[PDB]
Design an enzyme around this catalytic site. Structure first.
Site, PDB file in Angstrom:
ATOM      1  N   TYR A 180      -2.669  -7.085  14.755  1.00  0.00           N
ATOM      2  CA  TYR A 180      -3.431  -8.438  14.252  1.00  0.00           C
ATOM      3  C   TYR A 180      -3.276  -9.401  15.287  1.00  0.00           C
ATOM      4  CZ  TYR A 180      -2.668  -6.516   9.484  1.00  0.00           C
ATOM      5  OH  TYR A 180      -2.514  -5.646   8.626  1.00  0.00           O
ATOM      6  N   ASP A 197       3.258 -10.497   5.406  1.00  0.00           N
ATOM      7  CA  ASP A 197       3.106  -9.223   5.863  1.00  0.00           C
ATOM      8  C   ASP A 197       2.498  -9.244   6.943  1.00  0.00           C
ATOM      9  OD1 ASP A 197       2.295  -6.269   5.353  1.00  0.00           O
ATOM     10  OD2 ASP A 197       0.091  -7.157   5.995  1.00  0.00           O
ATOM     11  N   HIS A 252       1.291   2.224  10.466  1.00  0.00           N
ATOM     12  CA  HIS A 252       0.063   1.765  10.155  1.00  0.00           C
ATOM     13  C   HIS A 252      -0.919   2.942   9.703  1.00  0.00           C
ATOM     14  CE1 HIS A 252      -2.074  -2.265  10.900  1.00  0.00           C
ATOM     15  NE2 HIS A 252      -2.724  -1.792   9.622  1.00  0.00           N
ATOM     16  N   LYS A 263       4.102  -3.426  11.269  1.00  0.00           N
ATOM     17  CA  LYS A 263       3.717  -2.103  11.402  1.00  0.00           C
ATOM     18  C   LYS A 263       3.465  -1.493  12.664  1.00  0.00           C
ATOM     19  CE  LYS A 263       0.285  -3.651   7.672  1.00  0.00           C
ATOM     20  NZ  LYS A 263       0.565  -4.888   7.931  1.00  0.00           N
TER      21      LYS A 263
END
Length: 312
Positions: A49, A44, A112, A79
Site C-alpha cells: 500500500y 489491516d 499476500h 502482508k
C-alpha cells in the site's frame, strides 16, 4: 466497539478492522487516529500500500507506554509482497515492515498472494510489453520461512491471502504452524460459501475485503437500510459480521469510519439473511487485468500457482 473472534492461537480478533488498502500516505494518519478514537482496535496493512511509515507515525502518537491505547489492545496485520517470496527475503521484508510501522511484533502476518514476482526491490517488475516478470518460488517454500518468524517472535500468527482450497490444503500438509486466517474478496455477489465452509473444516477464520463489493443499489439492501435506520454499507457489513466473517472496510472519511464500526447493535432475522444470501453470482471484481488491444484480459491466469482458475 467491535466484538471479536477467537483464533486457534487463543488470540481475539475484532470483527471490524480499518482497511488501509488504498489510503493515501497523506490522508492515512488522520484516518488511523480518528478510528482509534471511535473504538477501532484492528488495523489491516500491507507493505504494497506504501503507507506503513505514515501509519507508523500515527500509531507512534497513540499506542504504547503513556498513550491512549496500549499495544496489547491492538491487533495489527501486515502482508509479505510478491517480490519477497524467496526464503532468504522473508525475514528482512518483515523487519522492514516492523521498522516502518514502528512495532516490536505483528499480530497477524499474511502471504499476500500464492504466486511470486521476480525476486527484487521493484514491486512491479515488468517487461516492455507491460507484462509481469514472475518467479517460481513455491508458496510452501516461502511458508517454511514465515514459520521461522513466529518462532523468533516477530509475528503471532500467520495467514494466507487469495489462496484457493487446494492451495490451503497444500500448505497445511507441510506446516508446523497452522495458518490462522484466510483473507479474500467477499460480499453478497461473491459470497464464498464453499470456501468459508472449507476453511471451517480446516480451522481457519475468514476475513473479507471489498465487503461493499451496484451492490449498494440493491432493493433488498435499500429496504433493510430503511428498515434499520442504517446505510447500505452498514447492511453489507452486518451480513458479514452476523455470518461471523471479519470485515476490513477501507476508508479515509470519519463519517464512514464511524458508521463502519457501528454494526453490532442490531440484527437481521432469518428471512433477511436469506434475502442477502440470495444475491450471489460468483462475481469477483478483484482480478489483476491487462489491457491488450482495447480489451481487458486476465493478467496472471497462466501462472502455475494462480488461485482463481479452480472453482473455489
Amino acid at each position: 466497539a467491535a466484538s471479536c473472534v477467537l483464533l486457534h492461537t487463543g488470540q481475539k480478533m475484532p470483527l471490524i478492522g480499518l482497511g488501509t488498502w488504498k489510503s493515501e500516505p497523506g490522508q492515512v494518519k488522520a484516518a488511523v487516529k480518528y478510528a482509534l478514537s471511535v473504538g477501532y482496535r484492528h488495523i489491516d496493512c500491507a507493505a504494497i500500500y506504501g503507507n506503513e511509515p505514515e501509519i507508523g507515525e500515527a500509531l507512534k502518537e497513540d499506542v504504547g507506554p503513556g498513550k491512549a491505547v496500549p499495544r496489547e489492545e491492538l491487533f495489527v496485520t501486515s502482508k509479505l509482497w510478491n517480490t519477497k517470496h524467496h526464503p532468504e527475503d522473508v525475514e528482512p521484508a518483515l523487519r522492514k515492515t516492523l521498522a516502518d510501522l514502528q512495532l516490536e511484533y505483528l499480530d497477524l502476518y499474511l502471504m499476500h498472494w500464492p504466486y511470486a514476482f521476480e525476486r527484487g526491490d521493484n514491486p512491479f517488475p515488468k517487461n516492455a510489453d507491460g507484462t509481469i516478470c514472475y518467479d517460481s518460488t513455491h508458496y510452501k517454500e516461502t511458508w517454511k520461512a514465515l514459520e521461522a518468524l513466529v518462532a523468533k517472535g516477530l509475528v503471532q500468527a500467520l495467514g494466507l491471502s487469495n489462496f484457493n482450497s487446494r492451495q490451503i490444503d497444500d500448505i497445511l500438509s507441510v506446516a508446523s504452524v497452522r495458518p490462522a486466517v484466510l483473507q479474500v474478496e467477499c460480499h453478497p455477489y461473491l459470497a464464498q460459501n464453499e470456501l468459508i465452509a472449507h476453511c471451517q473444516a480446516r480451522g481457519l477464520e475468514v476475513t473479507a475485503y471489498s465487503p461493499l463489493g451496484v451492490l449498494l443499489e440493491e432493493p433488498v439492501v435499500l429496504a433493510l437500510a430503511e428498515k434499520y435506520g442504517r446505510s447500505p454499507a452498514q447492511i453489507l457489513l452486518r451480513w458479514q459480521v452476523q455470518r461471523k466473517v471479519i470485515c476490513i472496510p477501507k476508508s479515509i472519511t470519519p463519517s464512514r469510519i464511524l458508521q463502519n464500526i457501528k454494526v453490532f447493535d442490531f440484527t437481521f432475522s432469518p428471512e433477511e439473511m436469506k434475502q442477502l444470501n440470495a444475491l450471489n453470482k460468483n462475481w469477483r471484481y478483484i482480478v489483476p487485468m491487462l489491457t491488450v488491444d482495447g480489451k481487458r484480459v486476465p493478467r496472471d491466469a497462466g501462472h502455475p500457482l494462480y488461485p482463481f482458475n479452480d472453482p473455489y
